[PDB]
């Protein structure tokens, strides 16, 4: 169980907005993930397997832990944070740092549609971090190259595959790429 803390994952943005907007107004915007941003857990094997199209942001309800709130997708719905193209660091926070096989990071394609549900064919792999099966916290921050051919509203998807289960954690990040 864990989430991407820098940049701020949408899930983690939910937990944050709970503090500023209150429980009801934040849950209206994000769903029940605001209480458990660490629980965006669904089947591993992405992109060939894993959560279905339209259910990637919520990891298909976090396998019963959260609702489908994160699967809403419009140009205006989610808080964007500025990111510059090129090398960037991605830092996960773990509430339970499980044995890990790999992490893998995707960005939306130049022509993606921000007003349609997320589909796996809108995403392109930008880097893989292989791990030895030790706990996730032996490598907290990853250096990933974010394509420089691309700007405006994009989504970075980070995926954390758990070594000893059939699950993974899916964290979408809303970015304004300069
Ligand atoms: Cu966990």
C-alpha 177 to ligand 1 mean position (Å)? 31
In the chain, the N- to C-terminal Cα span, in Å, equals 31
Q: Do the bridges between strand 123-130 and strand 100-108 make them parallel or antiparallel, or are there none, so unpaired?
A: antiparallel
C-alpha 148 to ligand 1 mean position (Å)? 33
C-alpha 78 to ligand 1 mean position (Å)? 25
Q: Output the six-digit token pair for 57.
A: 């942001």
Q: How was this structure determined?
A: X-ray
C-alpha 99 to ligand 1 mean position (Å)? 10
Q: What is the CATH number of domain 1-178?
A: 2.70.50.50
Helix (H) or strand (E) holding 4: strand 2-6
Q: What is the resolution of this structure in A?
A: 1.9
Query: In whole angstroms, what is the distance from residue 25 CA to residue 107 CA?
Result: 29
C-alpha 153 to ligand 1 mean position (Å)? 30
């Amino acid at each position: 169980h864990g989430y991407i803390k820098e940049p701020v994952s949408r899930a983690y943005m939910g937990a944050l907005e709970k503090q500023t907007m209150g429980w009801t107004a934040a849950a209206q915007k994000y769903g029940s993930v605001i209480d458990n941003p660490q629980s965006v857990e669904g089947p591993k094997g992405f992109p060939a397997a894993g959560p279905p199209d339209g259910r990637i942001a919520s990891a298909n309800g976090g396998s019963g832990q959260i609702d489908f709130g994160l699967d809403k997708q419009t140009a205006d719905h989610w808080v964007k944070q500025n990111i510059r193209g090129g090398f960037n660091t991605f830092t996960w926070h773990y509430t339970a740092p499980h044995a890990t096989s790999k992490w893998h990071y995707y960005i939306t394609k130049k022509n993606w549609n921000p007003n349609k549900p997320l589909s796996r064919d809108e995403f392109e792999l930008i880097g893989t971090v292989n791990h030895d099966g030790s706990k996730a916290d032996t490598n907290l921050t990853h250096k990933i190259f974010v394509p420089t051919d691309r700007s405006g509203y994009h989504i970075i998807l980070g995926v954390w595959d758990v070594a000893d289960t059939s699950n993974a954690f899916y964290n979408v990040i809303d970015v304004n790429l300069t």
